[PDB]
Structures are given as structure tokens and as C-alpha cells.
């Protein structure tokens, strides 16, 4: 240890040539004992190295080589000191990098090397990426962008751009974000790109600009719109005059899409509906429409003839915003008719398909008949060309659009019926062509679903026989036909369809249904409905069961302008057919079971067959055909149990030896299928009964083997910036399989408590809780973090609460887990979003023992710690939003704040009083979330109203906070946002609480002339 200090003291001097020997010794003295002693030392050697660096630089080609070798020494030290773990102090290193890069006295290659080291050693480390303060981010951005604007053109410029990119991402993902005043910086760069032809690094600069606009669009919406109106013409000029490379074109397209999203949230056509309109924006829209039309007729826009999907989406959005220089659907019709080559016809078909699908109201009624006239002329070619699928998709979209309209005239209806019947006649021939069998059937469905064509006898013949093998589109068309048609007798047909569905080659060659995945409970419903006396009624009854990016910013925009407001808004079965179906299913199951081999057959086929059997049984049980108790004694249940027992052999074999790597895929597929089999919802559906049967199928040995495999796996030992520790790229195949098995076990435990099963849910739950033991779990491991988050999200349940000791076991390591990731914003947000699920079990107070208060304190202290850290401006708006969601859940759990009190600094705060504080936040999205969720303070939400005084006090406090938000006051956007927050709070109070209606109305009347609320906005809200 003393040797290093002596060597550093010697190196502090200035020798003529012995300093080279000292440097060689420094490079060569790094050994394992020295590294072990350095653990805390690195700061001192680093500052001594800085002394040497400044002394050496104090004293052309030779100087350039000296700079190169000194940079090599610096990077060698940096990679050696952090090779095992990030230990070097980061702020001083960032200061060193800034000092070396800002001055132009150093050589260009030396600055490039320093920037490369900053990019590859600092921004690539998660700890350094997360610990950097906002001021350092801003000064780094300024320094590294001022360098970019310099006229010195070299190879490092592109690299510099990359730096900015990374920095921008960091400043938008770890702090409050860059100020709006930085935007002009970006603008300057664009202006340079207007005259500079090389355009070395515009892609990275524009990607950083896109990230900045995405972050800055939530506020300052009008500012962003003005910036777009200022910038976009230059981008169009660059697109016209540049080389038209790939990455730059894609980034420009993405930026145009973002601008259109901001100007027209969710396709707001007019200003009164939410759009922001300007003459410059309209001219830009027309110019960009012309540019995209010109770009479509190009080889590079697409052997392949389809256009890239992003271009089609942008084109459809522009057309919707432009359509009423007519520029209407007649342009599309003319392009469809005039174009002869299929290369010039597919893009317009794609554009029409997207326009119809996204905006059905765009196409007027009067254009329905002519359009179908044109499309019917493109399809009937006897050979199926490369343009046939696109024509079929366009026809399907047109049919689905027509099905949604009810203001059609009788003559129009007759003409449409004639055209639909004709094109049905053309499209029916050639159905045997498998090459387009996915599209054809779908079109047929669109015809059948809308009842646009009467089904003939020959259509039913298509399903029977060997004309077409079963497939997902074919089965979907079949169930659509069964829903809105009556099967002709021609028993000979229903049994034929049943045999076709259940066909298996007699003596190997597994049936197509067992090979291809189908949507859950689709084959079983068809099979059951076939056997019933009234197939159409049974299918309708089955279908009648009740249901169990930048989009959110667009929804926030719509909410701010008050254009969207989420609030204030006897069967009989043929015995012979049933026996035939049972015989066919039993025969298929037996043929699968006896042919089974330990290696030859696949694992998921057995599970698919078992799922089919239990689904058929559950579909029978949903109606009155079969009884619950004697469905267990049926031979089908025994065969399904045997199939599952045979399937468990693979699990046992993998348990015997885990080192095998080729069995992971099949096990993962089987676990995913089993997870899909089970359901946790309880609404008296065939899915619930099928899930119960499947749960009863599983034996205790399989569950114990799965738990043992999970324990063994758990115990077993380009991108822009740092990688998120929760990223899936850190997970191997074994980790993914372990996560799938853990999810399956969690669902089994959660759903097993309702029913009775062979295995014991308590033992499996105890084994699961053994995984998060303090001695075993290390939060620093990504797999353990994923395991803990999955357990937190899955284990708690509302219908059947867990024992409070299990809740304590779940909550025990949470304090440490939050302690490790205090710095990371993304991990904190994920942790909050996952922990908000425990409040359902925490709120129970029937067994209010000491364990209940212990668990409640354990959770509330963590929530209060997060709130206290938030109050000190320590977390970004995402963590604040997650905290708001958690507090809303807490308010739902305990309306009266009997136990939900946050303790911090020796003081206590009720959750209700804390919640109203978020109405004066600095971010619009958090304020809107709080204002929209404020209704929890006036209703039980478990719908009985709260006492009078509580409601009065809550309304007064919320109104006062909303007033104070405005009271603390180019910046029209802030004023507009605060006014919208106030009006939204008043509207929510009016909609939810009938007691405070008069008070809310009087407050609105006062604020009309006191706060300067816009009369038209409040008028619209009051009208609604």
C-alpha cells in the first residue's frame, strides 16, 4: 500500500525522462492485492493522475502522438478501475471530460477520444447514468451542442451527434427535462442542414429533437405547434434536395407523424373538436401531401410492391385531414382506375384500406356504390396475382364500413346488395387456393357478419369433406356463419362438419386443430352448438356473455379541451349428435394417447387436447345439458386427466437434469398454454368452468415438481444509453422459463382457493414465499427483482384475502428493495405500480390483530418515504403519477382515513389531505390525473355518499388548492392548463356529488368573472 503512495509522490515531481519510467511502473504495478486494497483510494490516484496530465500538457505530429498515448493511458486507467464495478467518483470525471472537450487547444483526435470515452464508459453505466444531476445534464448538452455547430467538419461530428442524442435521452428520462428555450438551438442546426449538403449526423440530431418534443409536448403545446410551423418547411426542402437515404427519411417521417399527432389529437378535424389550426399549418399539410404523393411513385418507397406501413399511416392521416384542387375520394378512384401496372396500384389500395379502417366516416355514402364498382373490376382475374390480397382486404374494410351505417337509401341498398352478391360469386371460386386462404375467408366473414349475402347450400359443402383443412380464418368464418344462419339438414351435414373439425388420419399425422393455436373457447363453442337443437340460438347465447406510446398524451390533450369526458358518461341437445361428438372426441384422445412416445410427440399437443376436452365439458356445463358433479365422472374427464399425467413426464425429466438447453422452448410453450387455460375472473362464464375443470385436472406431483424446478432455477447462478435493469435482454432462456413457471404457479394458487383440488394451495404458497427469503434473495440481481415484482403483482387477491403473515412476508424485503433503487426513476415507477396491488389485502380489518397493524405500518412508512422524497423535488413526473395512483388506491381502500395515515418527520398526515396537494403540481398530466380521480373523496367507491362535513371540507380544500395554482402568477399554455384543471375539478364535483351541486355551481359562477374562465368552455361543460 505504501509503495503506491511513494510512487505517486515521486510522480508528483517533474523529471526530464524518469517520468516515463514512473509511468511504465504505474501501468505495470496494478496487481490483485493493490486492487483489493483500493476498495473503499481511487480518488487520490485519479487526482494525482490529473496532476500529471496537467503538468504534461503544460510542457504537431509528435504532440499529436503524445496526446494519443496519454489518452490511451487515461482510457486504460478508466477501464481498469471500473472493470469489476463502478467505483470511481463520477462528478470529478465529468468535470475532467468537460474541461478537456471545451477548450480547442487540444487536438481534434484527442477531443474525439475523450468524447468516445465519455460515450462508452460513462453513459453506458447505469449508476453513473442515474446519479447525474440536472445541472450537469444541461451544461453537458450546451457544451456538446455548441461544439456541433462549429464549422470544423471532420469524422467526429457524427459521433458528437450521438453524444447529444444520449444526453438528450438522459435529460428527458432522469430529470425534469430541458427548458423550452433550448428549442432554438435545434432550429439553428436545421438551418445549417438547409445549406450543408453532406449532412453528417442529422439522423441523431433529429431523433434527439423527436425525444425532446415527445417530452415537452405535454406542456407548451402551442409552443411546439409554432416550432413545427417554423421548422417543417425546411425539412420538406431537405427531403426534396437531399440524397434520400434510409435512416434520415425514417426519422423525418416519424417527426412528421408526431407533429400531426400533436396538431390533430386522434383525428380532430376541426378547431371546435380539439384541433389546432393555422394557415401555415394548412399550407404545410398540402405541401406534405404533395410530397408524399410524389414519394409513393418510387421504387425505394417499397420482389416486394407493398409500401412501408409508416408511410401508409402518415398518408392516411394527411388524407383524412385534407379530404372534405378538390382532393377527395375521386382522386383515389381515378388512381385506381387509371393505373394498369400492379406496381402503381397496390399503394393506393393500401391507402384506401387504411383510410377506411381508421376513419370509417371519411368515405361518404354516395361514393360507396362507385368504389365497389371499381374494386369488383380488379378482382375477377382468373389467375390470382400479387395484387389480389390487397383488393380482398380493401373489400373487407368496405364491407365492415358499410355494416356500421344505418342511413342508406333503398335504391343504394339494392345496388349494394347486387354488387355484394356479384363479388361474392367471383370471390367464391378460387377458394381452394390456399395461397390467399387467410384473406378470402375473412372477406366472406365481413359479408356474412353484415348479412350482405344470403348463404346458399354450396357454401356449407366447403367446410365438409377434404376441400379445405381447418384453420383459424376458416373457423372464424364458420362461427360467423353459425351466428347468423341456419344449418340446412341436407344430421348428415352437422355430423359432416363435426367430422371435418375432428378429422384425424387413421394410422402419426396429428390433426391440424392440435397443431395450430386457436382463440380460447372457439372450437368447443362450435362443437357444442352443433349438437344443440337450436344451433343459432346456442351460438348467440355463447356470444352474448359479458366481457370480463403517444396515445395517452393525445387523450390528455382531448381532456384539456373538454372534448372527451370519461366521467359523466332452456336449451335441449340431440342425444345422437352428443353421443357422436363424445365418441369422436374420445377416439381422437385415445389415438393421441396410445401413440404417445417419450420423445417423438410434442408436449403442447397433449395440453391442447386436454384443454379442448375440458372446454367442451365446461361449455356443456354452462347450459343445462350436463351437471357439475356427474361431469367429473365422464370418460372425457378421465381421458383428459390421463393426457395431463402423460404430459407431466417432460416436467419430471427436466427436473431430473436442468442443464439441458433444447427442452426449454417446449416447456415455455406448454407453460404459456397452461397459463392461458386458467382464468381468475368470476362472472359465470364457460371460461370459468373450463378453468375450474383444468385446475382440477392437475395433480400434486406435477405442482411439486414445478415448484422444485422454480427453486432450482432461482438458486442457479444498438441502444443509446444505459440499459434498464428490468430490460428483457438481461434475461436468458432459463430465466424466461422460470418466470413463466412462476406466473403459472401464482395463478394456480390464486384460483385454487375458490374450488377444491388434489394438491394443497397452502403448501405451494409457502414454497413460493420461500423464494423471497431474506437469506436467499438479493435485490441487486435482475432475475430476483423480476421474481419479487411478479410475486407482488400476482399473489394478493381481493376475493380471497391472504393470511396476514403472508402479507408480512411479502412486505418484509420491500424496504431494502426500494433502498437499492432509490436513484432509478424507472425502477421506482415500476415498484410503485406493482406495490399498489397489495392495498386490496391490506385494507381488510376483520382480523385486526397485531399483524395487521405491523403490515399497515410497513407499507405506510414506505409510502410516506416516497411522498417525503417527492416533496423535495427528487422524482420525475412518472414516479409522481405512480404515487398518485397508489394514493388513489389507498383512498379507495379506507375512505375515512381510519388507518391510512402517512407518518414522516414525527408528524402524521391523513391521505385525503395529502391527495388534494397534487392539484398544484408543476406537470399538467399529474394535475389532470388528480383532478379526474378527485371523485374518490366524495363517494365510498366500494356508492353511498360521505358525511356532509367531510364533503364540504374536501370541496373547499380542493377548490382552494386549484385557486392557489393559478394565484402564483408567451405563457398562455400554463394559464390554459390551470384553467382546464379548475374546470375539470368543478365538473367532476358536479357529476359525482349531488350534495355539492349548488356549491360547485356558485364556485363556477364566481370563477367566470374572477378567474377569467372562458364562457364558452364552461357553457359546453354545463351543457354536457
Amino acid at each position: 500500500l505504501n509503495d503506491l503512495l511513494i510512487c505517486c509522490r515521486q510522480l508528483e515531481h517533474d523529471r526530464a525522462t524518469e517520468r516515463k519510467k514512473e509511468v511504465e511502473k504505474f501501468k505495470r504495478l496494478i496487481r490483485d492485492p493493490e486492487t483489493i486494497k483500493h476498495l473503499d483510494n481511487w480518488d487520490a490516484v485519479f487526482r494525482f493522475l490529473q496532476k500529471y496530465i496537467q503538468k504534461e500538457t503544460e510542457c504537431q505530429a509528435s504532440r499529436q502522438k503524445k496526446m494519443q498515448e496519454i489518452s490511451s493511458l487515461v482510457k486504460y486507467f478508466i477501464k481498469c478501475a471500473n472493470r469489476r464495478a463502478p467505483r470511481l467518483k463520477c462528478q470529478e470525471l465529468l468535470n475532467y471530460i468537460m474541461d478537456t472537450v471545451k477548450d480547442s487547444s487540444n487536438g481534434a483526435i484527442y477531443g474525439a477520444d475523450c468524447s468516445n470515452i465519455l460515450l462508452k464508459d460513462i453513459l453506458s453505466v447505469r449508476k453513473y447514468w442515474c446519479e447525474i444531476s440536472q445541472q450537469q445534464w444541461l451544461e453537458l448538452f450546451s457544451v456538446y451542442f455548441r461544439l456541433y455547430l462549429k464549422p470544423s467538419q471532420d469524422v467526429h461530428r457524427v459521433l458528437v451527434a450521438r453524444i447529444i442524442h444520449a444526453v438528450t435521452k438522459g435529460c428527458c428520462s432522469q430529470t425534469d427535462g430541458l427548458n423550452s428555450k433550448f428549442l432554438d438551438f435545434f432550429s439553428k442546426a436545421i438551418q445549417c442542414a438547409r445549406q450543408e449538403k453532406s449532412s453528417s449526423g442529422l439522423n441523431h440530431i433529429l431523433a434527439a429533437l423527436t425525444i425532446f418534443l415527445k417530452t415537452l409536448a405535454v406542456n407548451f403545446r402551442i409552443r411546439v405547434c409554432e416550432l413545427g410551423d417554423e421548422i417543417l418547411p425546411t425539412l420538406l426542402y431537405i427531403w426534396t434536395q437531399h440524397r434520400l437515404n434510409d435512416s434520415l427519411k425514417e426519422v423525418i417521417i416519424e417527426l412528421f407523424q408526431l407533429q400531426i399527432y400533436i396538431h390533430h389529437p386522434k383525428g380532430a378535424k376541426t378547431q371546435e373538436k380539439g384541433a389546432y389550426e393555422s394557415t401555415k399549418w394548412r399550407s404545410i399539410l398540402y405541401n406534405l401531401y404533395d410530397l408524399l404523393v410524389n414519394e409513393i411513385s418510387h421504387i425505394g418507397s417499397r420482389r416486394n410492391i407493398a409500401v412501408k406501413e409508416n408511410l401508409i399511416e402518415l398518408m392516411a392521416d394527411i388524407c383524412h385531414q385534407v379530404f372534405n384542387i378538390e382532393l377527395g375520394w375521386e382522386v383515389i378512384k381515378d388512381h385506381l382506375q387509371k393505373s394498369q401496372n400492379d406496381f402503381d396500384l397496390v399503394p393506393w389500395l393500401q391507402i384506401a384500406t387504411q383510410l377506411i379502417s381508421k376513419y370509417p366516416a371519411s368515405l361518404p355514402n354516395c361514393e360507396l356504390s362507385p368504389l365497389l364498382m371499381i374494386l369488383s373490376q380488379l378482382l375477377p382475374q382468373q389467375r390470382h396475382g400479387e395484387r389480389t390480397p390487397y383488393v380482398l382486404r380493401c373489400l373487407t374494410e368496405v364491407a365492415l364500413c358499410q355494416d356500421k351505417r344505418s342511413n342508406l337509401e333503398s335504391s343504394q341498398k339494392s345496388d349494394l346488395l347486387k354488387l355484394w352478391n356479384k363479388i361474392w360469386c367471383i370471390t367464391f371460386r378460387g377458394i381452394s387456393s390456399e395461397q390467399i386462404q387467410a384473406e378470402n375467408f375473412g372477406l366472406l366473414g365481413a359479408i356474412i357478419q353484415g348479412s350482405l349475402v344470403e348463404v346458399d347450400r354450396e357454401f356449407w359443402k366447403l367446410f365438409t369433406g377434404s376441400a379445405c383443412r381447418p384453420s383459424c380464418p376458416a373457423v372464424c368464418c364458420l362461427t360467423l356463419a353459425l351466428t347468423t344462419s341456419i344449418v340446412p339438414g341436407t344430421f348428415s351435414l352437422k355430423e359432416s362438419i363435426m367430422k371435418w373439425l375432428l378429422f384425424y388420419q387413421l394410422e402419426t399425422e396429428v390433426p391440424p386443430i392440435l397443431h395450430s393455436n386457436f382463440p380460447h373457447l372457439v372450437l368447443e363453442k362450435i362443437l357444442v352448438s352443433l349438437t344443440m337443437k337450436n344451433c343459432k340460438a346456442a351460438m348467440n347465447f355463447f356470444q352474448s356473455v359479458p366481457e370480463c406510446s403517444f396515445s395517452e398524451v393525445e387523450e390528455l390533450f382531448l381532456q384539456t379541451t373538454f372534448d372527451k369526458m370519461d366521467f359523466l358518461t332452456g336449451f335441449s341437445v340431440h342425444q345422437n349428435l352428443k353421443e357422436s361428438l363424445d365418441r369422436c372426441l374420445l377416439g381422437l384422445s385415445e389415438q393421441l394417447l396410445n401413440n404417445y412416445s417419450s420423445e417423438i410427440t410434442n408436449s403442447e399437443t397433449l395440453v391442447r387436447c386436454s384443454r379442448l376436452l375440458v372446454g367442451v365439458l365446461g361449455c356443456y356445463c354452462y347450459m343445462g345439458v350436463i351437471a357439475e358433479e356427474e361431469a367429473y365422472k365422464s370418460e372425457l374427464f378421465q381421458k383428459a386427466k390421463s393426457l395431463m399425467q402423460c404430459a407431466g413426464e417432460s416436467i419430471t425429466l427436466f427436473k431430473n437434469k436442468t442443464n439441458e438447453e433444447f427442452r426449454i422452448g417446449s416447456l415455455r410453450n406448454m407453460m404459456q398454454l397452461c397459463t392461458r387455460c386458467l382464468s381468475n375472473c368470476t362472472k359465470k362464464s364457460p371460461n370459468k368452468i373450463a378453468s375450474g375443470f383444468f385446475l382440477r385436472l392437475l395433480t400434486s406431483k406435477l405442482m411439486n415438481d414445478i415448484a422444485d424446478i422454480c427453486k432450482s432455477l432461482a438458486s442457479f447462478i444498438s441502444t443509446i444509453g444505459a440499459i434498464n435493469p428490468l430490460a428483457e435482454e438481461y434475461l436468458s432462456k432459463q430465466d424466461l422459463l422460470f418466470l413463466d413457471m412462476l406466473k403459472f404457479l401464482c395463478l394456480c394458487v390464486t384460483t385454487a382457493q375458490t374450488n377444491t383440488v388434489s394438491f394443497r394451495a397452502a403448501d405451494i404458497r409457502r414454497k413460493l414465499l420461500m423464494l423471497i427469503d431474506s437469506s436467499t434473495l438479493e435485490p441487486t440481481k435482475s432475475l430476483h427483482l423480476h421474481m419479487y415484482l411478479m410475486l407482488l403483482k400476482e399473489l394478493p387477491g381481493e376475493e380471497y384475502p391472504l393470511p396476514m403473515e403472508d402479507v408480512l412476508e411479502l412486505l418484509k424485503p420491500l424496504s431494502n428493495v426500494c433502498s437499492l433503487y432509490r436513484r432509478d426513476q424507472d425502477v421506482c415507477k415500476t415498484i410503485l405500480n406493482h406495490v399498489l396491488h397489495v392495498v386490496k389485502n391490506l385494507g381488510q380489518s376483520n382480523m385486526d390483530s397485531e399483524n395487521t397493524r405491523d403490515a399497515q405500518g410497513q407499507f405506510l412508512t414506505v409510502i410516506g418515504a416516497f411522498w417525503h422524497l417527492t416533496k423535495e423535488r427528487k422524482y420525475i413526473f412518472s414516479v409522481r403519477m405512480a404515487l398518485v395512483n397508489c394514493l388513489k388506491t389507498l383512498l379507495e381502500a379506507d375512505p375515512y382515513s381510519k388507518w391510512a395515515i402517512l407518518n414522516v418527520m414525527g408528524k402524521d398526515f391523513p391521505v385525503n389531505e395529502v391527495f388534494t396537494q397534487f392539484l398544484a403540481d408543476n406537470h399538467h398530466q399529474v394535475r389532470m390525473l388528480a383532478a379526474e380521480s378527485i371523485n374518490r373523496l366524495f363517494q365510498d367507491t366500494k356508492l353511498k355518499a360521505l358525511p356532509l362535513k367531510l364533503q364540504q371540507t374536501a370541496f373547499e380544500n380542493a377548490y382552494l388548492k386549484a385557486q392557489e395554482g393559478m394565484r402564483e402568477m408567451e405563457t398562455l399554455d400554463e394559464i390554459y392548463n390551470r384553467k382546464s384543471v379548475l374546470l375539470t375539478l368543478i365538473a367532476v364535483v358536479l357529476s359525482c356529488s349531488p350534495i355539492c351541486e349548488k356549491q360547485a355551481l356558485f364556485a363556477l359562477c364566481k370563477s367566470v368573472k374572477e378567474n377569467g374562465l372562458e364562457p364558452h368552455l364552461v357553457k359546453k361543460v354545463l351543457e354536457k
Binding site: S815, G857, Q858, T861
Partner: peptide, 10 residues
């Protein structure tokens, strides 16, 4: 600095 996260019954 980090003692806030820990739960203290006493």
C-alpha cells in the same frame, strides 16, 4: 439520507 425507507416500530 436513506433511513426513511426502513420501518421502525419503536
Amino acid at each position: 439520507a436513506d433511513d426513511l425507507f426502513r420501518y421502525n416500530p419503536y
